[PDB]
């Protein structure tokens, strides 16, 4: 079997610039290289076949290339919707072998999180469980650490952490930190905090609650 | 133009057999064989094989000759893949995609993907909560309010805010399996004029249980 090797695995380029994705086979595959693009939560679209010929309607920004065992796919004037997983399939001999993909991330300006801590719902409290939900929306860079602090004591157990993929309109990410707790445990305490540390600061972004009117 | 719709995603417990249907449209079935591909979650794309939609005879990949069986109902232009004795390691999204040429060296036009979760876990309906804030104006004249869909099986659930009308401002975070069940959440940010004045709602459908839920995020503060 022919073996397509894709390295690197992640690529970041800014909007309007160039990126290039490198693919390589384990023997001269005589230019029989196809490139698919898999848009997040979509099927692949065939962009190029025979290393450089575009399929019907992939706009000329995408420039296939290469020879022998070394091929590359260039994209220019990179669009915030160019975010996808790019794969090379080879098409010379059976079986048709793919590559590992390369995620093309869009480098953006830094943006700081919009943090929302939410109390347990009365109805969840009725069921004997509490969940505090911290939302951290629209930050850039990617990396933000969130810690929970129940009455000054760092909670480090009981938290599920979900991140949105990169947004293809404003190129940002968003996180959902959920502390799931017991009614009786919720009521043993009172200060609950979602404290977050992202590049846009020094002094932690810190949101905290307990029920009072407004 | 060319459209290939696949079956709805299935839950099967280890050992069963599953026939995924790919009903092809737009082109002439008889002139273009079918490719079946495997998108594992942590692995990327795998050619499973191809079926001559003309002669009916299939070429399997090595990783698949033996529990997978391609077949087709040409009469309805449907190509079907079946997996016998489901080993949980068949957890993936199998794609049907058109073989542009003989043998499938180019899959132009792919189908939507059918997801397969091979689990012994019980189908569990979700419990939905409206996550109102302890007030807290979330940035300039915007209030963000949420909805938490908790403890169900299996994926998916269809969360929409306000019957689709609240499309901007929404972030639905990926569902995560805490061992036996799933937790989901989305936020939506609206201007203060809009809420609590207009009626914000979370509509959540978990079709596995046959569940349709509608939660008003009414101001509880």
CATH at A134: 2.60.40.10
Tell me, yes or no, whether A133 and A185 share the same domain: yes
Instruction: Please state the CATH superfamily assignment of the domain spanning residues B1-120 in this structure.
Output: Immunoglobulins (2.60.40.10)
Tell me, yes or no, whether A38 and A121 share the same domain: no
Tell me, yes or no, whether A79 and A115 share the same domain: no
Cβ contact, residue pair B45, A133, below 8 Å? no
Give the separation between CA B101 and CA A91, rounded to whole angstroms: 11
Give the separation between CA B157 and CA B99, rounded to whole angstroms: 33
Name A74's Cβ contacts closer than 8 Å, sequence gap at least 6: A18, A19, A20, A21, A62, A63, A64, A65
8-state DSSP, B89 = G
In A151-204 the beta strands, taken as DSSP E runs, fall at: 153-155, 159-163, 173-182, 192-198
**Strand, helix or coil at A211?**
coil
Give the separation between CA B63 and CA A90, rounded to whole angstroms: 18
Taking a C-beta distance cutoff of 8 angstroms, is the pair B158, B186 a contact? no
What separation in angstroms does the CA of A186 have from each of A91, A92, A112, A160, A194? 59, 62, 30, 17, 15
Q: Does B96 touch chain A (CB under 8 A)?
A: no
Best B6, B131, B159 residue to mutate vs chain A (most A CBs within 10 Å): B131
Q: Could you say which residues from 57 to 76 on chain B have a Cβ atom under 8 Å away from some Cβ of chain A?
A: 59, 61-62
Could you report how far apart the first and last alpha carbons of chain A are, in Å?
Answer: 67
Dihedral angle of Cα B194, B214, B179, B93, to the nearest 10 degrees:
-90
Listed by start position, the domains of chain B span 1-120, 121-212
Phi, psi for B89 (deg, rounded to 5) = -65, 5
Q: Count CA atoms within 13 Å of residue A3 on its CB side.
A: 3
Host domain of residue A149:
109-211
* Size of chain B, expressed as the number of residues it contains: 221
Beta bridge partners of A208: A193
DSSP string, A76-121: -S--TT--EEEEEEE-SSSS------EEEEEE---B--EEEEEPPP
8-state DSSP, A202 = S
DSSP string, B112-173: --EEEEE--PPPB--EEEEE--SS---STTEEEEEEEEEEEBSS--EEEEGGGTB-TTEEEE
Strand (E) or helix (H) holding B178: strand B170-178
Instruction: Calculate how close chain B gets to A58, using CA atoms only, in Å.
Output: 12
8-state DSSP, B83 = E
Two tokens at B94? 């199998």
Taking a C-beta distance cutoff of 8 angstroms, is the pair B49, B69 a contact? no
Tell me, yes or no, whether A116 and A177 share the same domain: yes
Give the separation between CA B163 and CA B188, rounded to whole angstroms: 13
Chain B residues near residue A133 by CB distance under 8 angstroms? 131, 146, 148, 185
Name B101's Cβ contacts closer than 8 Å, sequence gap at least 6: none
Boundary residue ending a domain (A41, A73, A108): A108
Phi, psi for B98 (deg, rounded to 5) = -75, 130
Q: Does B173 touch chain A (CB under 8 A)?
A: yes
Taking a C-beta distance cutoff of 8 angstroms, is the pair A29, A14 a contact? no
Q: Which residues of B128-142 are buried (b: 16+ CB within 10 A; e: fewer)?
A: bbbbbbbeeebeeee
Data resolution in angstroms? 2.9
Tell me, yes or no, whether A9 and A104 share the same domain: yes
Give the separation between CA A197 and CA A141, rounded to whole angstroms: 11
Domains B1-120 and B121-212 share a fold: yes
Q: Cα dihedral sign for A151, A154, A158, A159? A: positive
Could you report how far apart the first and last alpha carbons of chain B are, in Å?
Answer: 52
The number of beta carbons lying within 10 Å of the beta carbon of residue B147 is: 26
Greatest Cα pair distance, chain A, in angstroms, is 71
Taking a C-beta distance cutoff of 8 angstroms, is the pair A51, A4 a contact? no
Boundary residue ending a domain (A78, A108, A138): A108
Taking a C-beta distance cutoff of 8 angstroms, is the pair A156, A146 a contact? no
Give the separation between CA A53 and CA B163, rounded to whole angstroms: 43
Chain A residues near residue B134 by CB distance under 8 angstroms? 118-119, 209-212, 214
Q: Does A177 touch chain B (CB under 8 A)?
A: no
Q: Cα dihedral sign for A155, B176, A175, A99? A: positive
**Strand, helix or coil at A8?**
coil
Cβ contact, residue pair A114, B45, below 8 Å? no
- State the alpha helices, DSSP H only, in A43-197: 122-126, 183-186
Strand (E) or helix (H) holding A145: strand A144-150
Closest-CA residue of A relative to B103 is: A94
Experimental method of this PDB entry: X-ray
The number of beta carbons lying within 10 Å of the beta carbon of residue A191 is: 12
Give the separation between CA B147 and CA B124, rounded to whole angstroms: 18
β-pairing, A205-209 vs A114-118, is: unpaired
Top CATH class of B121-212 equals mainly beta
């Amino acid at each position: 079997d022919i073996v397509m090797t894709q390295s690197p695995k992640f690529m970041s380029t800014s909007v309007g610039d160039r990126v290039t994705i490198t693919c390589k086979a384990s023997q001269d595959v005589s230019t029989a290289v196809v490139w698919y693009q898999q848009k997040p939560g979509q099927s692949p679209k065939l962009l190029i076949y025979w290393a450089s010929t575009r399929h019907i309607g992939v706009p000329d920004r995408f420039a296939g290339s290469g020879s022998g065992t070394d091929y590359t796919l260039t994209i220019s004037s990179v669009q915030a919707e160019d975010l996808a997983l790019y794969y090379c399939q080879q098409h010379y001999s059976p079986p048709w072998t793919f590559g590992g993909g390369t995620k093309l991330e869009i480098k953006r300006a830094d943006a700081a999180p919009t943090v929302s801590i939410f109390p347990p719902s009365s109805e969840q409290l009725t069921s004997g469980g509490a969940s505090v939900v911290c939302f951290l929306n629209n930050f850039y860079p990617k990396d933000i650490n969130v810690k929970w602090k129940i009455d000054g004591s760092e909670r480090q157990n009981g938290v599920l952490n979900s991140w949105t993929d990169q947004d293809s309109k404003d190129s940002t990410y968003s996180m959902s930190s959920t502390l799931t707790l017991t009614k009786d445990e919720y009521e043993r305490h009172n200060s609950y905090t979602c404290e977050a540390t992202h590049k846009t600061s020094t002094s932690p972004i810190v949101k905290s609650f307990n029920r009072n009117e407004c | 133009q060319i459209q290939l719709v696949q079956s709805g995603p299935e839950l099967k417990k280890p050992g069963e057999t599953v026939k995924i249907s790919c009903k092809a449209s737009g082109y002439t079935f008889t002139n273009y064989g079918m490719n079946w591909v495997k998108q594992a979650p942590g692995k990327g794309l795998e050619w499973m094989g191809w079926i001559n939609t003309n002669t009916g005879e299939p070429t399997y990949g090595e990783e698949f000759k033996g529990r997978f069986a391609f077949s087709l109902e040409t009469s309805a232009s449907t190509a079907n893949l079946q997996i016998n004795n489901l080993k949980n390691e068949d957890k993936a999204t199998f794609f049907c995609a058109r073989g542009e040429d003989n043998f499938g060296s180019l899959s132009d036009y792919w189908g939507q993907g059918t997801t397969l979760t091979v689990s012994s876990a019980k189908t569990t309906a979700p419990s939905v909560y409206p996550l109102a804030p302890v007030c807290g104006d979330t940035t300039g004249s915007s209030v963000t309010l949420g909805c938490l869909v908790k403890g169900y099986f299996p994926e998916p659930v269809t969360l929409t805010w306000n019957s689709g009308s609240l499309s901007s401002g929404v972030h639905t975070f990926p569902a995560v399996l805490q061992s036996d069940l799933y937790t989901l959440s989305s936020s939506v940010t609206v201007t203060s004029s809009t809420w609590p004045s207009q009626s914000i709602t979370c509509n959540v459908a978990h079709p596995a249980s046959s569940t349709k839920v509608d939660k008003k995020i009414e101001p509880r503060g």
